[PDB]
């Protein structure tokens, strides 16, 4: 019954409107929900030389890749969650659902 | 026998064991986060993976 959604994304606004649309689904069917708990962003970082050889002034690319992570805790029946999680998801988002 | 010799020498560690999954090169290897892609190769495919330049 204490069922835990773990939303993880690259893109914010895509994951922000999904976690909002899942918390809609918790209020539309009127079951208690701990809000969208913001887990810290993970900035993956590759700092590589720009030059394919070593024959320029020592410049460096600094690539990032942000991984935003939200979690939603519900007190829900399992089938209501497997119904809501199907509805309106987009490629930027990655959804887990832990039972217990 | 040659079948024993041909590939006898161990390839379990060192930059002669691992190579680029694109380039097939024994140099400029980015191992971090299980990329295993050459420093030229990843500089071409950074955008396509999701590695934006910002700071």
């Amino acid at each position: 019954h204490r069922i835990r959604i773990t939303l993880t994304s690259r893109n914010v606004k895509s994951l922000e409107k999904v976690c909002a649309d899942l918390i809609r689904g918790a209020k539309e069917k009127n079951l208690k929900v701990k809000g969208p708990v913001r887990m810290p962003t993970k900035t993956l970082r590759i700092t590589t030389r720009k030059t394919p050889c070593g024959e320029g002034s020592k410049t460096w690319d600094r690539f990032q890749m942000r991984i935003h992570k939200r979690l939603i805790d519900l007190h829900s029946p399992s089938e209501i969650v497997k119904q809501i999680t199907s509805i309106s998801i987009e490629p930027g988002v990655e959804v887990e659902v832990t039972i217990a | 026998g040659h079948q024993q010799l041909y590939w006898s020498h161990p390839r379990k560690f060192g930059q002669g064991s691992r190579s680029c999954r694109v380039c097939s090169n024994r140099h400029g290897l980015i191992r971090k986060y299980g990329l295993n892609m050459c420093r030229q190769c990843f500089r071409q495919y950074a955008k396509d993976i999701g590695f934006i330049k910002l700071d």
Binding site: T8, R10, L44, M65, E94 | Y33, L35
Partner: peptide, 19 residues
């Protein structure tokens, strides 16, 4: 996964697939 892949590795491997 059965060997249970890391989240940071997952989003890298997902990008490498697309590539």
């Amino acid at each position: 996964m059965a060997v249970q892949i890391s989240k940071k590795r997952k989003f890298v491997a997902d990008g490498i697939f697309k590539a």
